[PDB]
Amino acid sequence: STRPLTLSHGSLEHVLLVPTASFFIASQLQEQFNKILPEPTEGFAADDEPTTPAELVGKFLGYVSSLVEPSKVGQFDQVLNLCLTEFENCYLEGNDIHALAAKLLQENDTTLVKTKELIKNYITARIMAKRPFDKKSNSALFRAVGEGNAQLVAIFGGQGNTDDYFEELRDLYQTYHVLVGDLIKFSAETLSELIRTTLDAEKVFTQGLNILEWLENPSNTPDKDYLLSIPISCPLIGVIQLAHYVVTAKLLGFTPGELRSYLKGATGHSQGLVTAVAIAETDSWESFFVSVRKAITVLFFIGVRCYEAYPNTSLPPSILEDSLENNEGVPSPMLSISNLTQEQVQDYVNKTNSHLPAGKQVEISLVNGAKNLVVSGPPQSLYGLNLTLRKAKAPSGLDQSRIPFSERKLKFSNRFLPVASPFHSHLLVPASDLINKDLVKNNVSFNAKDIQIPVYDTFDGSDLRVLSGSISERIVDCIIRLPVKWETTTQFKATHILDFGPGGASGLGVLTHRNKDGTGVRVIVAGTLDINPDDDYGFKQEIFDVTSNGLKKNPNWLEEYHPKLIKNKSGKIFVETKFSKLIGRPPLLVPGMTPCTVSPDFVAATTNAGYTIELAGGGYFSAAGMTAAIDSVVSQIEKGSTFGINLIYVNPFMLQWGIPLIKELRSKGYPIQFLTIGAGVPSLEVASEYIETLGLKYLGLKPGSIDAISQVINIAKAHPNFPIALQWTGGRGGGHHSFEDAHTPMLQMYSKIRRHPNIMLIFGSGFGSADDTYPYLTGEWSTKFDYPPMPFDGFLFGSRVMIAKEVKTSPDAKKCIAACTGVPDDKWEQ
Amino acid sequence: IADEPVKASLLLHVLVAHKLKKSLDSIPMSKTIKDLVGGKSTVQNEILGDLGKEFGTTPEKPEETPLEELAETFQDTFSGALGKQSSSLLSRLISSKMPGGFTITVARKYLQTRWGLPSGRQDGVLLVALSNEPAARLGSEADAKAFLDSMAQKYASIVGVDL
Amino acid sequence: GDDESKIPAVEYFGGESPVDSEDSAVFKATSSTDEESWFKALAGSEINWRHASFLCSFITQDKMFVSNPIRKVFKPSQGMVVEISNGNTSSKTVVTLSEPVQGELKPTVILKLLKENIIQMEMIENRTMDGKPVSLPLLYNFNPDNGFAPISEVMEDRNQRIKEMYWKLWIDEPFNLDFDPR
Numbered sequence A: 001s002t003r004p005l006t007l008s009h010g011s012l013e014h015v016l017l018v019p020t021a022s023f024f025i026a027s028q029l030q031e032q033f034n035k036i037l038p039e040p041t042e043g044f045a046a047d048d049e050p051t052t053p054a055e056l057v058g059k060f061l062g063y064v065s066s067l068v069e070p071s072k073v074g075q076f077d078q079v080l081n082l083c084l085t086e087f088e089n090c091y092l093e094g095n096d097i098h099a100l101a102a103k104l105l106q107e108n109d110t111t112l113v114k115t116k117e118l119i120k121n122y123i124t125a126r127i128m129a130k131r132p133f134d135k136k137s138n139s140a141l142f143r144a145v146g147e148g149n150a151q152l153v154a155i156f157g158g159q160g161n162t163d164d165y166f167e168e169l170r171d172l173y174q175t176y177h178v179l180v181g182d183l184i185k186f187s188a189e190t191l192s193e194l195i196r197t198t199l200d201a202e203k204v205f206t207q208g209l210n211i212l213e214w215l216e217n218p219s220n221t222p223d224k225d226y227l228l229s230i231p232i233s234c235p236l237i238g239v240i241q242l243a244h245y246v247v248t249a250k251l252l253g254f255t256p257g258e259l260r261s262y263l264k265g266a267t268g269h270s271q272g273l274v275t276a277v278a279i280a281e282t283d284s285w286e287s288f289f290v291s292v293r294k295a296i297t298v299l300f301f302i303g304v305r306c307y308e309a310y311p312n313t314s315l316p317p318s319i320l321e322d323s324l325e326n327n328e329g330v331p332s333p334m335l336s337i338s339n340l341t342q343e344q345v346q347d348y349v350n351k352t353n354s355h356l357p358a359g360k361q362v363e364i365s366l367v368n369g370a371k372n373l374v375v376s377g378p379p380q381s382l383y384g385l386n387l388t389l390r391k392a393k394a395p396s397g398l399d400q401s402r403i404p405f406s407e408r409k410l411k412f413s414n415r416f417l418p419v420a421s422p423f424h425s426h427l428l429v430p431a432s433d434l435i436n437k438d439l440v441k442n443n444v445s446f447n448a449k450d451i452q453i454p455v456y457d458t459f460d461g462s463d464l465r466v467l468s469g470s471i472s473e474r475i476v477d478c479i480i481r482l483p484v485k486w487e488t489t490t491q492f493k494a495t496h497i498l499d500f501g502p503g504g505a506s507g508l509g510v511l512t513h514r515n516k517d518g519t520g521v522r523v524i525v526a527g528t529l530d531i532n533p534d535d536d537y538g539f540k541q542e543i544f545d546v547t548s549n550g551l552k553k554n555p556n557w558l559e560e561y562h563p564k565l566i567k568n569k570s571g572k573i574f575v576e577t578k579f580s581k582l583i584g585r586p587p588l589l590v591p592g593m594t595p596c597t598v599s600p601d602f603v604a605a606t607t608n609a610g611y612t613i614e615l616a617g618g619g620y621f622s623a624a625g626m627t628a629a630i631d632s633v634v635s636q637i638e639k640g641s642t643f644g645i646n647l648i649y650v651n652p653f654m655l656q657w658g659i660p661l662i663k664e665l666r667s668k669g670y671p672i673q674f675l676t677i678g679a680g681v682p683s684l685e686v687a688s689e690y691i692e693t694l695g696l697k698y699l700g701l702k703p704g705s706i707d708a709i710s711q712v713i714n715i716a717k718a719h720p721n722f723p724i725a726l727q728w729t730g731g732r733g734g735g736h737h738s739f740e741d742a743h744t745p746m747l748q749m750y751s752k753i754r755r756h757p758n759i760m761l762i763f764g765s766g767f768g769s770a771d772d773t774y775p776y777l778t779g780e781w782s783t784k785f786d787y788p789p790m791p792f793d794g795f796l797f798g799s800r801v802m803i804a805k806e807v808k809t810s811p812d813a814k815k816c817i818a819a820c821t822g823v824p825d826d827k828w829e830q
Numbered sequence B: 001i002a003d004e005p006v007k008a009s010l011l012l013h014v015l016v017a018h019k020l021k022k023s024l025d026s027i028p029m030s031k032t033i034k035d036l037v038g039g040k041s042t043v044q045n046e047i048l049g050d051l052g053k054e055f056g057t058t059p060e061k062p063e064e065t066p067l068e069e070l071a072e073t074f075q076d077t078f079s080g081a082l083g084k085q086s087s088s089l090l091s092r093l094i095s096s097k098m099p100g101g102f103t104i105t106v107a108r109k110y111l112q113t114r115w116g117l118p119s120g121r122q123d124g125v126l127l128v129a130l131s132n133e134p135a136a137r138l139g140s141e142a143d144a145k146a147f148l149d150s151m152a153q154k155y156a157s158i159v160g161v162d163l
Numbered sequence C: 001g002d003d004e005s006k007i008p009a010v011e012y013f014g015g016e017s018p019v020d021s022e023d024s025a026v027f028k029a030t031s032s033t034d035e036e037s038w039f040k041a042l043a044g045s046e047i048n049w050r051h052a053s054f055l056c057s058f059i060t061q062d063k064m065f066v067s068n069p070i071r072k073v074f075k076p077s078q079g080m081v082v083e084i085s086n087g088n089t090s091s092k093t094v095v096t097l098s099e100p101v102q103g104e105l106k107p108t109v110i111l112k113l114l115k116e117n118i119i120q121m122e123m124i125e126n127r128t129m130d131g132k133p134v135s136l137p138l139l140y141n142f143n144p145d146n147g148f149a150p151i152s153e154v155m156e157d158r159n160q161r162i163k164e165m166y167w168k169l170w171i172d173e174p175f176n177l178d179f180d181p182r
């Protein structure tokens, strides 16, 4: 026997069959929760107000769990187990609260604030009724790890990921105060003992470090300076990385030994390297609070002794106002130089270090990517560097599109770092010995035998286990002396990567992704919940989700766009690429050239040699004029042989007669295979007409710039089923050309192009032989610029074919084309 | 008063102004989103997710483009449509500042009656409400109508229509 | 590794959009039969003449590219039943269609290789003057050397065959078209 109890808010309701024996207490709870429930609003888009019935049950669960005692099993445990079971039998069809909170955000009018309230309220209510996550959650990731399909590494963030680290630590203590409560008081008692133990700490820490006080009461929380000061910033980033790691392991229901055992390896960035060894050693929940005490003691002693070494220095208001007037950020001993090569930044450092003595020099501290460097020195000598750098940077409101690429002024964003000590700087070198003495005095040593999985050094990328010297000496020496090489350390092979670092969405996870996109490494941002709109990196939800859509890896461009060989019945060998598969001829075309491909002879003589050539619209002025040429092609070529038509997009009159002319020749079954729009890209409406009306097999396009490529992709979106041949041509091409370098725009867009599989990306502009094409067929061309291989579907040869025997070019023009020597890419802009 | 589809330069401006927590005069359009946000990339990447929720397609790297060059690019494929994000942003603006009970329909007919301002003006009018959000809930109904008069006077000044 | 033997082999190389075992099968055509899954299931999996026949969306007439009649005929409608006999070797594979003719189920379309380089979509009418069903041999060349449109309809005497069929259906004389119209 059961008695129905409804909980409603305006239009949304939920019915819960409460046992009639204890029903009269569930209507005592229902009135008091519906008092806590605000006034109803249209859309339910008000904050601290449920939007879904699911978020109303999760708000009730959290209201009842807020009153339950984890010692004294009161009456409200026997009313949580019936509304948390209905939660599991209404909403949680297998998957966690996180993979369905990801459903809510993207589908219903649900926000990240009330989603992280639902996560907190469910997680408090599950562990409140004394139901810890003990079972092994069968996440498709882990299933694949067990089967061997997936490999995981656990990266760990350093400093400067965010302006405020402490807000991720407040969000962990907000959502997970029930689970983290053990680590926070333990760390607060280790540090508040060290302070009375280690000398000078009491001086280093003025407002003290009883973190328990500032996490219970957010109001007393000091500025992000006493917090930003590294003797406090380091240990609390040590804490938050373990806090993510433990929160993951708990939710899963694995021991820190099991989660550690699963991972192929682990690594950290700057001072996150300590967390990686702290999780590599650990075996059991009991044998965790020894890895915690080590990590916290190390980060404490680096922090304290580095702040006593090179101290923070007061700064003239005259420098601070100028630095924040150019939006270069608040001056600090760490400066990030986005979108520039390493050699460039070292050049500028050398130029600034010319005017400075040895004690005040600036030195490249980090390389956090291909083009994402950090420099370190005295704030004044960094300002002195910044003065030189703002004299190179182009104005942000400038259009350079009409300027040659070599004449263009380089565009880049330099900023200062949210940090209060020059990490990986010679300035802190006198602290190394003192740190090492304070470690040995407290007896903190990481033994190479205790570390279970490999852990990758920041400086050289080697395993820390195989170290001859002290592991705690090497870690310190890596943090305060050695410049981190993030593209060197992340040279391991994996399928997924787990970001337990602070920062999340702007964390180290996304940085490593952009550093490694297209090597088939589905990186996971494990430190935050949200949905990736484009879906190239994951979040918290696919850690747990117990489905088939848990294993959805990233692409490995060198693999699925590896050119093959294939053979027909005749023993003819074809190069197989995405493009040649469609057209059934080699993926080599001759693009519409006025006047080289005007001649109906040269269009038929190229087709009868078994190749795809465009008839040049440019050369014809009336529907009759072209129609004669087409017919002459049709009469000359063999049966079943095809060809295409090239229409310039700056001649509206041509398009006006042309587009009908094709449309009705398609209607009469004329062998017109494809239309190539040259010199611009049609609008979505014009392209949508051309694709759906003219009954082609695919639409050629020659986008001019990056913006044009953006539009070409937008047409490829609108019409996903219809093949598009993006015929990308650099400025270095013959005839009507742009000002662009042939390479760079691909190195920006190539990812985004390959996301839509219908686009046959056809490279060209420069080529006249197999040798120089080979790098672009394979995808190795892009290795030179420090990218993953990015292989192309096919080519086009304008200028190379102009001296062919069946081209109408006058015999004296051919001697003039031949005579021309030509020049390598680099020189073309002259 | 003549009805036109909402201007996608005002919409963008309100988003960036309300998103950073700044007024309409402080942030000019001749400035990139990276410049005004400064350091914080946590803001940037989900401003780029909010612009992708409004208009859908965005340019390549709309981070370092002035908001004239970005607004102008939205005019190509925009037509008056508030969509999802701005419609929910006005739904959590009313349900936080307008007195408990005040509906959008009230304000709309009120703008139609007092001012003669149709739906294509009222979208842009509600965007001026959000961007210059009042501090606390305007419990007094008259105070909510005295705010709706001052913001419809900022809308009529900015657009350049006499009211 | 410079060994041509290692290179895969197919019939004809082409006509594969970039977006993407049974010998004796019987496919019943439902009202809500998916056209694409149907045609794939007719084509099977192996790339042979029959695969071209049901998945190419354009055939060749002379030099003109017309809409594939093989797909048009075999378009699934309720009451259609297709059998595929000998569907492990192409050379022998036949595709018989039966439909409800005067209530009862009768064979209509026999698609098969008449030769190694010739298709024949033998079309059959049952509703005749004498009762014996009348037969129309629509020939087609399967040339796998053209990987885009490997199916070219045999235009040689196509009118001669079609007429010769309609003669047997209408006229009750011996077939002869060499007389003066005047």
Ligand SMILES: Cc1cc2nc3c(=O)[nH]c(=O)nc-3n(C[C@H](O)[C@H](O)[C@H](O)COP(=O)(O)O)c2cc1C
Residues within 6 Å of the ligand: A591, A592, A593, A594, A595, A596, A616, A618, A646, A648, A677, A678, A679, A702, A729, A732, A733, A734, A735, A736, A764, A765, A766, A767, A796, A797, A798, A799, A800
């Ligand atoms: C003589 C000549 C005529 C051309 N005519 C056209 C044309 O009508 N339409 C067009 O889009 N591109 C035209 N182009 C550009 C080519 O299609 C192609 O992008 C270029 O030739 C490839 O670079 P390459 O010459 O370095 O091989 C022409 C190029 C040349 C050299």
